[PDB]
Design an enzyme around this catalytic site. Structure first.
Site, PDB file in Angstrom:
ATOM      1  N   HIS C  53       0.860  -1.179   0.000  1.00 38.58           N
ATOM      2  CA  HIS C  53       0.000   0.000   0.000  1.00 38.58           C
ATOM      3  C   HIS C  53       0.897   1.229   0.000  1.00 38.58           C
ATOM      4  CE1 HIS C  53      -2.304  -3.074   2.181  1.00 38.58           C
ATOM      5  NE2 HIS C  53      -3.397  -2.511   1.712  1.00 38.58           N
ATOM      6  N   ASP C  56       2.355   1.923   3.346  1.00 37.04           N
ATOM      7  CA  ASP C  56       3.356   0.995   3.859  1.00 37.04           C
ATOM      8  C   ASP C  56       4.755   1.428   3.463  1.00 37.04           C
ATOM      9  OD1 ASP C  56       1.316  -0.818   4.665  1.00 37.04           O
ATOM     10  OD2 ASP C  56       1.425  -1.874   2.730  1.00 37.04           O
ATOM     11  N   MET C  87       2.515  -5.766  -7.972  1.00 33.40           N
ATOM     12  CA  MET C  87       1.216  -5.247  -7.585  1.00 33.40           C
ATOM     13  C   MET C  87       1.399  -4.175  -6.528  1.00 33.40           C
ATOM     14  SD  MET C  87      -1.173  -5.374  -4.924  1.00 33.40           S
ATOM     15  CE  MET C  87      -1.364  -6.888  -3.961  1.00 33.40           C
ATOM     16  N   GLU C 180     -10.780  -6.531  -4.818  1.00 35.84           N
ATOM     17  CA  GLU C 180     -10.703  -7.548  -3.787  1.00 35.84           C
ATOM     18  C   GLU C 180     -11.963  -7.558  -2.957  1.00 35.84           C
ATOM     19  OE1 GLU C 180      -7.131  -7.488  -1.682  1.00 35.84           O
ATOM     20  OE2 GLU C 180      -7.803  -8.878  -0.096  1.00 35.84           O
ATOM     21  N   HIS C 219     -11.293 -14.484   2.707  1.00 34.28           N
ATOM     22  CA  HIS C 219     -12.474 -13.628   2.582  1.00 34.28           C
ATOM     23  C   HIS C 219     -13.674 -14.382   2.066  1.00 34.28           C
ATOM     24  CE1 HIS C 219      -9.767  -9.819   2.477  1.00 34.28           C
ATOM     25  NE2 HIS C 219      -9.641 -10.527   3.587  1.00 34.28           N
ATOM     26  N   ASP C 254     -11.355 -12.080  10.048  1.00 36.10           N
ATOM     27  CA  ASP C 254     -10.335 -12.380   9.042  1.00 36.10           C
ATOM     28  C   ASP C 254      -9.035 -12.740   9.748  1.00 36.10           C
ATOM     29  OD1 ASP C 254      -9.213 -12.130   6.348  1.00 36.10           O
ATOM     30  OD2 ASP C 254      -8.783 -10.025   6.725  1.00 36.10           O
TER      31      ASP C 254
HETATM   32 MN   LIG Z   1      -5.920  -9.303   0.750  1.00 36.39          MN
HETATM   33 MN   LIG Z   2      -7.900 -10.991   4.912  1.00 38.05          MN
END
Ligand SMILES: [Mn+2]
Ligand SMILES: [Mn+2]
Ligand SMILES: [Mg+2]
Ligand SMILES: [Mg+2]
Ligand SMILES: [Mg+2]
Ligand SMILES: [Mg+2]
Ligand SMILES: [Mn+2]
Ligand SMILES: [Mn+2]
Ligand SMILES: [Mn+2]
Ligand SMILES: [Mn+2]
Ligand SMILES: [Mn+2]
Ligand SMILES: [Mn+2]
Ligand code: NA
Ligand code: NA
Ligand code: NA
Ligand code: NA
Ligand code: NA
Ligand code: NA
Ligand code: NA
Ligand code: NA
Lengths: 387, 387, 387, 387
Positions: C53, C56, C87, C180, C219, C254
């Protein structure tokens, strides 16, 4: 390899391999099996024994002469094969009379009938040599909040189990009871929905020593719970009288997949626990060959239950015996977990500056648990990928 | 309308309205509240009292002089408002030292420290007048199967609670303990995951009368369980020492929505049960105003907790008092559920042909339960739509 | 054995091994890692690349000179190791400004800012060589029904993605987007909660070819869905642009366990599918070493992600190559599933008496699927227990 | 009060009130109903119409003369009552031939038969005036990973739906198709498990305009999803061709409770959405009176479905019409959510310093959403507790 023998104490319900495949949306896909057929086929696979509901062995409503003939044929099959009958149970769920329950039906006449039906089958179970009598109260519960006063229902459930305990005591029987929890299905919510609730209930019975649990892998997983953890609590309580082995994919309807299917790693940890603890009871499968299968698939699925148990037993034993794993367990302080916190006693703990004023919390917090390396050793052992 | 008064015994944790909004993915959205602020604002809304973890009231690591000043300010706020402190608890989950547990940490030094931290706060709780000391073992558990031997962990958990019971007995304190189950989060699986497991564990403590449960609405719902049913079992056992009220939308992370949110009909049946049973303890909210909210939204959310309880109380009382509902309850045989199955005793039951040979199962099975009409009366009462 | 090489295209987010361990109930247990450290350590384990990100890599609010220095150090680490950056993504979830969303915040000013923040990072992603730009709309959603008009939110989400597509087209960039899905957490319900919802949404974008999905194992499992099935639908649609690999134990918060943990058999079937389909994208891990671990455990957990993929790859390849499995697949008619139902066309089907009047439904229904034997061959291959 | 009229377009499947009560564990508790009986009783309750599977109206295997007589009697009942038939569907799940699927059975002969069975019933549906033809692929899926190649199955599912579209086009019929998702049950996992997956699939059909979704409340809730959100996405896509209304308590087997039962607040938000959006289709109930009920309870449960819809409609309308709610919606910026993010266009957004360099993120982040006050107004309106 992995060939089961009667030594392994693998058992199956008549209703498992005998499930005809009717589901909420579908008609039967297989013909009914004669219990004699199932006994002989299971023996050929290396099973140790079978179990039954009353109405699996004796068609509901049978005359006394019909009952005798069904039992006689079954006993001949057991004698012909060496198969045992370690457990039996009552069907208090199929017949429409039980639509609101057996022991906790709102109608008192139904509760009394449920008890009489159970008592008749306890006598038969004892005659067949069963050590354990299971109770799965699948109809005990509700779809709506007003329908069932749960405190009153628990009073009725205790009354029923107390009467059954009085019965077996009065007859001098050695059989013991095992309550099988399930969270839901077929009722919207079932009473005693987990191992914990059943264990707690048992403590309030008049003769608690006569009752334990019969946990089922998939039922605890229908609440998203950790089945090995629940089995550990049952073992800790001295209450693991029997177990039902199968597979389940999480929070769904009760799938009754063959053992090893569903949550494979939970199956590994379960077998590790049962073997490490020295569980001596039957390894009983309460499963359903999927309705896609013909009879060859039925027997393949049953064989797979036993095979998967034996593979997992091998891998768990290798894990525990591996000096690298033993080192990792010490690195993760599993040895310390097993040692008393304060065998020195309360006053010594209160006086121990190392437990408070001089405890270096930041140094303690810096220590890693090394749980990931331990778990990857466990994975490598399960998969046979050490190296 | 629906205005709470201290009579209603509504209480809130300091950590509820004081939650700053940090979540697994997000920074705090609100500044920290001074406990004095929270006491005064909650009193203005009609709350009866507050509760605290040690580290909500006294910053972790405070000197003795700092501890005294924090407590003095808090007590002045309580005195200024008439607010009570019926319950307190220990934070054995936030600090990194507790990453593998408090009472069941694998490291023995951590277990001893956890006990000393708890004991210090029990003394403070008693000084503030608390009747109940809660324990939420949020770090007791595991993410992997090898990390935690659950039988050993239960031995350590029993040892800890037994030492705490010895402590309060030795000091002559009247406080009692309430264990708060949760199935998971922050650990992958938490020990004592449901009301049932906690009730069962308590029965094995040395002084079981000193311990009960503190069930939380959302925690039982994280296992998909029926919260009113679990509360009924706790009441049946005599163990509902305290309760945490909130809302939850099913099997998710612990949402801690305001009470009435989440499963509204379960909230209705819960209030009906608590009021019908005469539960006399605090109506405590363990909730979190969503991080979307500013402080006005914090106080609106807290007010909503109490408002929703009071609306539901009104509707449940009207349901139970309605002669049409009373008739429907009799039509559904709720009266019969409350009557013994066999007060005549086992031998009379065995001799009663009406319970077996002469029981007309088909006539019994034909009787409808009328549960749907009963449930629609309940819906109409909840919604204020009678007519 | 099972040693990863850059050939395997294993990648990791900076935020994975860099997760400091803060959870809903607990403070950080590990210090922050310099991205340079993570790049070098991951390279030593055999990773191919990292992902990031914006926030980050570049602390939020950095000056232009600070931004340049952070990127320069990171690029030197990539150059020193040969690691790639396939990515990148935007953090539209941590900062309090995003508490109600980025692209679907109710406040228009926030939506505009979210777009500008993303666009800035798309430029950086392209400069670092990324082929895919992920969007995880973790704050897009609601805790209450009135807070978010979902039709309006979908209009805003489409507007945002359309603007981003216009942007990359206008700049001549080859990067593509991957959405996502996640069902919940941190919002009570998240928009585009599953692979299906995201695939459906993409079809309504102005330039659908620029967008695909980035499904994450855990997820889909938070909705109890079959992750391999969802990946198959994404592959069928031509939309599997990237994937996030990890483990999850069912319907919980999660967990982001290492890949192979959680649902092991689903991991096996996933790897089988990716390899059989020739998926050519990164094998990216979005996981979190548990907060119990120190840095040695961080790197062990990362190594375990790759090891488990490689073990499963071996076992799935052996399954597919085994002549006994190939025979079982034919016995179960997997070959027939791959053949058109009616390449003869509609009129021929309507005229074909073998499809209706002369179809022997009972003979067809008698045929077993032999799925259990096939699945036990799959189990035997997974466990390395063939024989 | 709340009396339904045919104006309200309430419809019921023959299989709903006609469900005999067989469940995975229990025999039927009610006799079969003649469809004529159901039509007349539903009309008396104020229903608008009924729906049917082929095999609900015409016993499977009926001769042409038997088929004609069953249809003639049904049409007389419709004529006698004014009831309509807006929707029909095929039973591709009960008969054992469909144990591995209809359109996606591995056996090609079964796929062809499934198509012919559907086509025959499409003709009948058109003759009875149906506007929508539903497809619930309850047998499309798998219990094991090797049994079903999902890419191949999706190819077969597309082929089938494309052939059906060719059929209706060739016959000049105006009927359209509605695909009903379900995540699991009776298969371990069902293909097209959610509204999203079905919407995505439709986009790949040859004539996408002929196909929409038939979402069912309880089915989306079996994946823990937000049903109103999914309906919003279907509406956004222009694909809400029909809907199935019922209740469900979370992640369980498909309960098919009466509408309003289960998640009551989700029912409120659903009705609010349908009414606000002007949904013009049938309000169809796919529910099952619990097997505890006799026929009086069947009709009470059906009446309750309609009553609960009408209560919720009243409360949602009052919520939306309340000037205090309208003010709260503006306070929460629902108006802004409905306005374009960047109607000024991409270049203007890129040039707008107010969207980046001069955006005061901390001032924005300080603004509360006021969602809790809005939600408590919604609760007060639902409960009729305004004041
Ligand atoms: Mn992810
Ligand atoms: Mn996750
Ligand atoms: Mg030991
Ligand atoms: Mg009473
Ligand atoms: Mg192929
Ligand atoms: Mg609008
Ligand atoms: Mn089961
Ligand atoms: Mn069982
Ligand atoms: Mn909670
Ligand atoms: Mn709590
Ligand atoms: Mn359904
Ligand atoms: Mn339906
Ligand atoms: Na009673
Ligand atoms: Na035991
Ligand atoms: Na021990
Ligand atoms: Na109590
Ligand atoms: Na809009
Ligand atoms: Na693809
Ligand atoms: Na194909
Ligand atoms: Na529509």
């Amino acid at each position: 390899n992995y060939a089961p023998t009667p030594v392994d104490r693998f058992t199956f319900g008549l209703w498992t391999v005998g499930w005809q495949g009717r589901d909420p949306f579908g008609d039967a896909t297989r013909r009914a099996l004669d219990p004699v057929e199932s006994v002989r086929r299971l023996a050929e696979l290396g099973a140790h024994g079978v179990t039954f509901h009353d109405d699996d062995l004796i068609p509901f409503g049978s005359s006394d002469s019909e009952r005798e003939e069904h039992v006689k044929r079954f006993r001949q099959a057991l004698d012909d094969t060496g198969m045992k009958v370690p457990m039996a149970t009552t069907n208090l769920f199929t017949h429409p009379v039980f639509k609101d329950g057996g022991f906790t039906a709102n109608d008192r006449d139904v509760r009394r009938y449920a008890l009489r039906k159970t008592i008749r089958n306890i006598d038969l179970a004892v005659e067949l040599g069963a050590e354990t009598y299971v109770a799965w109260g699948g109809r005990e519960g509700a779809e709506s909040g007003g329908a069932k006063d749960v405190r009153d229902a628990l009073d009725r459930m205790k009354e029923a189990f107390d009467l059954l305990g009085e019965y077996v005591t009065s007859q001098g029987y050695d059989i013991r009871f095992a309550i099988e929890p399930k969270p839901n299905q077929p009722r919207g919510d079932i009473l005693l929905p987990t191992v914990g609730h059943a264990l707690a209930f048992i403590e309030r019975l008049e003769r608690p020593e006569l009752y334990g649990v019969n946990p089922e892998v998939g039922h605890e997983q229908m609440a998203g719970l950790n089945f090995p953890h629940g089995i550990a609590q049952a073992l800790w309580a001295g209450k693991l009288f029997h177990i039902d082995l199968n597979g389940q994919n999480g929070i769904k309807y009760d799938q009754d997949l063959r053992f090893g299917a569903g949550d494979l790693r939970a199956a590994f940890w379960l077998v590790d626990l049962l073997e490490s603890a020295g569980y001596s009871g039957p390894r009983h499968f309460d499963f359903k060959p999927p309705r896609t299968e013909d009879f060859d698939g039925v027997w393949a699925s049953a064989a797979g239950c036993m095979r998967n148990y034996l593979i997992l037993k091998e891998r768990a034993a290798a894990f525990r015996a591996d000096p690298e794993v033993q080192e990792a367990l010490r690195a993760s302080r599993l040895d310390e977990l097993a040692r008393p916190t304060a065998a020195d006693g309360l006053q010594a703990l209160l006086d121990d500056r190392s437990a408070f004023e001089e405890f270096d919390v930041d140094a303690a917090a810096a220590r890693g648990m090394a749980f990931e390396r331990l778990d990857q050793l466990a994975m490598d052992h399960l998969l046979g990928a050490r190296g």
